[PDB]
């Protein structure tokens, strides 16, 4: 039993809700919140911009030190950093950004990072400003993630289409 509330159960281990991931994380304070990161951990917009703003830029400060030490992530890769005031940990995961020409096949590799964590609060990878089809992202999530994932979908209109179209 966990403290996630109001989710629709899609499969044994995948759950979905219309919610602002920022407000969800503050309410739940989960062990792991997933950020929709880019390889530079520059949290300028989308989910990343919103998560960072909620930390008063502390996420960005930590991230800049991480990059200065380690260099950029790989597309499809991840790193674990602090969750700041939002969660215990933030799993920064880089899905492909279609508006950059990046191979959508890397979306499965990106979701594989979730399997290293028993429970996660997450957005749909590569959705929004990363340019991928969210219906595809949800399908890859369900077919790749085996751990318990709580998907937060900001847009109410988008949420209803994913549910009604879910196979
Ligand atoms: C599919 C996209 O990733 C879209 C659903 N992004 C988001 N999801 C949840 N919470 C959010 N807060 C700000 C952006 C955002
Ligand atoms: Cl977005």
Q: Whose CA is nearest to atom 4 of ligand 1?
A: 128
Strands 78-82 and 89-93: antiparallel
Residue 34 and residue 57: Cα distance in Å, rounded?
17
Q: For residue 137, what is the enclosing H or E element?
A: helix 134-144
The CA distances from residue 64 to 35, 68, 70, 81, in Å, are: 15, 6, 10, 11
Structure tokens at 95: 């899905």
Find the radius of gyration of the CA atoms of the chain. Answer: 14
Residue 62: count of CB within 10 angstroms of its CB: 17
Residue 66 and residue 61: Cα distance in Å, rounded?
9
Q: What is the DSSP letter of 167?
A: -
* CB 137 within 8 Å of CB 124: yes
Residue 6 and residue 20: Cα distance in Å, rounded?
13
End-to-end CA gap in the chain: 26
The full 3-state SS of 5-68, as one line of letters, equals: CCCEECCCCEEEEECCHHHHHHHHCCCEEEEECCCCCCCCCHHHHHHHHHCCCHHHHHHHHHHH
Tell me which of 107, 128, 149, 151 to substitute to probe ligand 1's pocket, judged by most ligand atoms within 8 Å of the beta carbon.
128
64 CA distance to ligand 2 middle (Å): 21
**Closest listed residue to residue 114, CA positions, set 133, 142, 153, 136:** 142
**Closest listed residue to residue 28, CA positions, set 60, 58, 3:** 3
11 CA distance to ligand 2 middle (Å): 24
What contacts 28, CB < 8 A, 6 or more positions away? 3, 4, 121
* CB 25 within 8 Å of CB 32: no
Using the structure block, give the residue that is written with the tokens 């990059």: 67
Domains of the chain: 8-163 (3.40.220.10)
CA angle 159, 82, 134 (to 5 degrees): 20
Structure tokens at 149: 């994932």
Method used experimentally: X-ray
Please tell me what resolution, in angstroms, this structure has. 1.0
Beta partners for residue 8, in sequence order: 16
Q: Whose CA is nearest to atom 14 of ligand 1?
A: 47
DSSP 106-132: HHHHHHHGGGGSSEEEEPPTT-GGG--
């Amino acid at each position: 039993v966990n403290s996630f509330s109001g989710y629709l159960k899609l499969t044994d281990n995948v759950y979905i809700k219309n919610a602002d991931i920022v407000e969800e994380a503050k309410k739940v304070k989960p062990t792991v919140v997933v950020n929709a990161a880019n390889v530079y951990l520059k949290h300028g917009g989308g989910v990343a911009g919103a998560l960072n703003k909620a930390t008063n830029n502390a996420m960005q400060v930590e991230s800049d030190d991480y990059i200065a030490t380690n260099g950029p992530l790989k597309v499809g890769g991840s790193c674990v950093l602090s969750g700041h005031n939002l969660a215990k940990h933030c799993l920064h995961v880089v899905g492909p950004n279609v508006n950059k020409g990046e191979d959508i096949q890397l979306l499965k590799s990106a979701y594989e990072n979730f399997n290293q964590h028993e429970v996660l609060l997450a957005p749909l990878l590569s959705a929004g400003i990363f340019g991928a089809d969210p219906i595809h992202s949800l399908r890859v999530c369900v077919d790749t993630v085996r751990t318990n994932v709580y998907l937060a979908v900001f847009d109410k209109n988008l949420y209803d289409k994913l549910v009604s179209s879910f196979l």
